[model samples]
Target: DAPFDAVLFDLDGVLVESEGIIAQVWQSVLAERGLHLDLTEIAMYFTGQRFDGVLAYLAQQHDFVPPPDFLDVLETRFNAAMTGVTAIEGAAETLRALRAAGVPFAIGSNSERGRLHLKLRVAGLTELAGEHIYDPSWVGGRGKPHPDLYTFAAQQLGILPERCVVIEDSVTGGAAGLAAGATLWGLLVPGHPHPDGAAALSRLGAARVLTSHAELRAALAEAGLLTPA
Candidate 1:
């Protein structure tokens, strides 16, 4: 009765609580350059294809040019904050559980490889994620809303895209996973809000919108990916 042979996770929100931190840092960096966009405006950029793509869009849309140190400053501050960042509840345990259950997993994220490594390190998931971290660099620069990252992760895992279950926290990631022929499972939390409403995830055809990791584990168990204790 198992429906999925593997799992694909979106890094920032699904595995590590880095969305709010990333957005806050982006806000501060932009503000330093007189591009004072609110958190909502800044956060919308997080779902973009790449960090530079987000910066380019901001420059294009707001007519603000970033200084050479913009990325450096953002990275510096973000990394500092990541020292205190926490993974989503049960995220690490869930990965270990998946491994014990013999289900393969990979991460398909829009983050740059270096930043992705920082996130995993702070969340204590570096060793667990191994080499299955699919960032834009891993997928020829294709990011969410393109399906390339998802497809590449699934391909690397030797699993058919249709047989993978993709867990995501944003509609953009969900869309990318769905486009890759995978099942979408949305994760939303008040601690880290995504751009889209819950209905957006539903409208994107998420198999379930889980409010917590416990719900995710329950659903996976029902799908035969975990044994209920």
Candidate 2:
């Protein structure tokens, strides 16, 4: 038997190479509010977090609530920025291989439904993940660094938490998966800039920290979950 019954993916940095675009958008938005921050700080504070959570953090740190239409404007800018975004290398192939291997999988992201679908579509993964995407908007729960999202995904997939595996690209997501009792693999993507990214993820309880999708495939093959392609 395979080591896991289901696989859960974190969308933004794991499946799509859109973190740069997202960071750029957030940078611009923050600039409009006179809160200039470097990309690393942006990633540290905002990556892997939900939109509302990010806004709350901004409010707490900057001492100002965004206008009611702030999210609307941010979404508009983000969608425009995402038009140029694409999937991470080997992401599509990996998903295809998992599907062919009969491993049930889903995307568990912090993005809202609309934005998540937009990213999936932009990354050319809508057909593979449309019905399987779980987000706080649809699942109605706290976001990552909390176990609720991962647990909800496992429940929805009809798999026990211990029988599930989560592929994450951020410490927040990794922590969430660990707390959910699922095996967690942290994918260190280039877009996430941290001085010691892999070590940080490992410290957060990642079962493995992978630098490439090829490494991820090998890990899954070792787990008897997928045939290397």
Candidate 3:
């Protein structure tokens, strides 16, 4: 089989670059709850993790107990605060181009459904692959660094795992892609682990490393994803 027949995108870092809002909200929330978390910590621990995993780690690391409905509160705050959120450069255009060219793609996020929808809608992605957007909570609660979510996505799309490509910006997500037997196109954004971390992940199974979506596209094109549509 070819390297890629479809694409699975990581929403926050790959397409929208929502780390700023996420970091700010986490910082303020931690401070409000009297737990001081530096931005670097937030970047390292929270990005690309499941909400439950993050909350559990916070509880264990800081002995912090969040209020009931903490996830909802955080989502609300993020949504409300992200009024001016912008999509990454070429994100919408790339999606449009891919869709127009009959490429199959979907969003695979570690976020809960509510938060995922909020970010997708805010970034104007609702029109492109919205129904295909997946949340770990809804699908057996599997999160990044686990292959379940990506495997589930491949099952839903009726594609073999190796034929599906994943675009990720975090090490956890990239690791999951590799574990799921997909080629990984890692986007190197500020605040996430180095894309070189993918090498350790690559040993697990099929994966590749790229600096950004454009690089991924170029790779895909070389693999024949962009040739004649």
Candidate 4:
């Protein structure tokens, strides 16, 4: 039996290696507008936010109304840039282990369904997740740093919030999971730049912070969610 009744995963930085690509695309977009944005700042501020919200925030910061087609153009560039996207190391193994153990899991992302599917398909995880992907768009609620999406996912899985564990890679996502009343596990990818990333996640209420697949695997085993291998 699984230690937790269900698991909720954050798609972008947690399961897929798309954060750098996203940052680069955003940087290009800002550069075209003669704005220079730091990549670390981008990762810190935007990793768990919805794209629409991100654009709105950027527009506010820059004091300009975004052109109507700005989001469309950004999506086009982002989709083109995502051609090289792949799964995070150990993510597949972790998911496979959970599957074999008969644990239920769902993706709770800030991305729209289309973009989320693209990332899952590119990472070869579409079949694993199937129709279990969700976002604030589906629930008509606010995204991360708010608990709505995570709670929605737990409900979808027919699990109580307290019986769900959320794996996230950003402080925003961590706070959301914690607020959702689920155990929050933070994934800290090596070399992903954020000032004091792991400590920051811990401060955001992560129950545990994992830096590698080995660490995650061990943690799962410790929690009785994964069999020792």
Which candidate's TM-score is highest? 1
Q: Write the per-residue lDDT of candidate 2 for residues 1-229, one digit (tens) a residue.
A: 6779889898877898777777888888878866788888786788657988997888888786666777888889976897877888889988888888888888888877787888888789888664678888655668887888889888888999899989987777888899999998988766545323788888878888888888898899989888755
lDDT of 4 by residue, 173-206 (tens): 8888899999999988786543237788888788
What TM-score goes with each of the models? 0.79, 0.78, 0.72, 0.78
Model 1 agreement with the true structure over 1-229: per-residue lDDT tens digits = 6799899998877788876777788887788788788777777665444767886787789877788887788778976887766688888888888888888899988877787888899888888776788889877888898899999999999999999999988778999999999999998866675767679899889988988877888889988889976
Lowest summed-lDDT stretch of 10 residues in model 2? 188-197
By lDDT, the best candidate is: 1
Which candidate, 3 or 4, has the higher lDDT?
4
Off by over 4 Å in 1: 26-76
Q: Considering only N, C-alpha and C atoms within 3 Å, which residue pairs clash in candidate 3?
A: none
Q: Is candidate 3 or 4 superior in TM-score?
A: 4
In candidate 2, how many Å is residue 117 off? 0.5
Arranged by lDDT with the best first, the candidates are: 1, 2, 4, 3
User: Pairing residues by index, what is the TM-score of model 1?
Assistant: 0.79
All candidates' lDDT scores? Answer: 0.83, 0.82, 0.74, 0.81
Collision count of model 1: 0
